[PDB]
């Protein structure tokens, strides 16, 4: 199977963790991964705009 | 050689692979990944790519459309007991 499996981060996406997310996001407002919940929050945009797409491939 | 990919890099690579219909198929007709809501929930989380500044990094635009379809389907999709996605049982 040359088809990869989904990213390891999937294990963190339990319904439990989803419930805890809203309060966690709040508390936060008051790579830096410290706990499971951090994975339910999109990673920050890199500075190098070289991640900006050169064009489309449809 | 480059160091191992970042989470941001891993997710950008992964969301974009969904632009390949066969691959999305190979997933849809998996077993294990639909037992638990994890994968389903992951795909909805990935819609973060559909808006700026994220979307401006997408080279394979179809993957966003397919994610959206894939996602809306999953809401009402009925999951068999084994993991089999019910609405697909007739197809290979």
Swiss-Prot record, chain A:
Top-level lineage group: Eukaryota
Protein's cellular compartments: Nucleus
Function: Component of the Mediator complex, a coactivator involved in the regulated transcription of nearly all RNA polymerase II-dependent genes. Mediator functions as a bridge to convey information from gene-specific regulatory proteins to the basal RNA polymerase II transcription machinery. The Mediator complex, having a compact conformation in its free form, is recruited to promoters by direct interactions with regulatory proteins and serves for the assembly of a functional preinitiation complex with RNA polymerase II and the general transcription factors.
Other comment: Present with 7598 molecules/cell in log phase SD medium.
Quaternary assembly: Component of the Mediator complex, which is composed of at least 21 subunits that form three structurally distinct submodules. The Mediator head module contains MED6, MED8, MED11, SRB4/MED17, SRB5/MED18, ROX3/MED19, SRB2/MED20 and SRB6/MED22, the middle module contains MED1, MED4, NUT1/MED5, MED7, CSE2/MED9, NUT2/MED10, SRB7/MED21 and SOH1/MED31, and the tail module contains MED2, PGD1/MED3, RGR1/MED14, GAL11/MED15 and SIN4/MED16. The head and the middle modules interact directly with RNA polymerase II, whereas the elongated tail module interacts with gene-specific regulatory proteins.
Family listed: Belongs to the Mediator complex subunit 7 family.
The name this protein goes by in its record: Mediator of RNA polymerase II transcription subunit 7
Curated annotation (Swiss-Prot), chain B:
A GO cellular-component term linked to this record: core mediator complex
Keyword Transcription among UniProt keywords: yes
GO biological process, one term: RNA polymerase II preinitiation complex assembly
Disulfide cross-links: none
Record has Chloroplast as a keyword: no
One GO MF term: transcription coactivator activity
Subcellular location: Nucleus
Keyword terms of this UniProt record: Activator, Nucleus, Transcription, Transcription regulation
TM segment ranges: none
Family: Belongs to the Mediator complex subunit 31 family.
Comment field (misc): Present with 468 molecules/cell in log phase SD medium.
Function in brief: Component of the Mediator complex, a coactivator involved in the regulated transcription of nearly all RNA polymerase II-dependent genes. Mediator functions as a bridge to convey information from gene-specific regulatory proteins to the basal RNA polymerase II transcription machinery. The Mediator complex, having a compact conformation in its free form, is recruited to promoters by direct interactions with regulatory proteins and serves for the assembly of a functional preinitiation complex with RNA polymerase II and the general transcription factors.
Subunit: Component of the Mediator complex, which is composed of at least 21 subunits that form three structurally distinct submodules. The Mediator head module contains MED6, MED8, MED11, SRB4/MED17, SRB5/MED18, ROX3/MED19, SRB2/MED20 and SRB6/MED22, the middle module contains MED1, MED4, NUT1/MED5, MED7, CSE2/MED9, NUT2/MED10, SRB7/MED21 and SOH1/MED31, and the tail module contains MED2, PGD1/MED3, RGR1/MED14, GAL11/MED15 and SIN4/MED16. The head and the middle modules interact directly with RNA polymerase II, whereas the elongated tail module interacts with gene-specific regulatory proteins.
Name used for this protein in its record: Mediator of RNA polymerase II transcription subunit 31
Organism: Saccharomyces cerevisiae (strain ATCC 204508 / S288c) (Baker's yeast)
Residues included from the entire protein: 16 to 107 of 127
């Amino acid at each position: 199977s040359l088809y990869p499996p989904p990213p390891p981060y999937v294990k963190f996406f339990t319904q439990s963790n989803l419930e805890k997310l809203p309060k966690y996001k709040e508390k936060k407002a008051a790579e830096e991964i410290t706990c499971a919940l951090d994975y339910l929050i999109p990673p920050p945009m890199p500075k190098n705009q070289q991640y900006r797409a050169f064009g489309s491939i449809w | 050689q480059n160091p191992l990919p970042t989470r941001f890099e891993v997710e950008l690579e992964f969301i974009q692979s969904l632009a390949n219909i066969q691959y999305v198929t190979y997933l849809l007709t998996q077993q294990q990944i639909w037992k638990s809501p994890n994968f389903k929930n992951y795909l909805k989380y990935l819609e973060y790519w559909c808006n700026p500044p994220y979307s401006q990094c997408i080279v394979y635009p179809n993957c966003l459309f397919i994610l959206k379809l894939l996602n809306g389907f999953m809401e009402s999709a009925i999951v068999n007991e084994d993991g089999l996605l019910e609405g697909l049982d007739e197809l290979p």
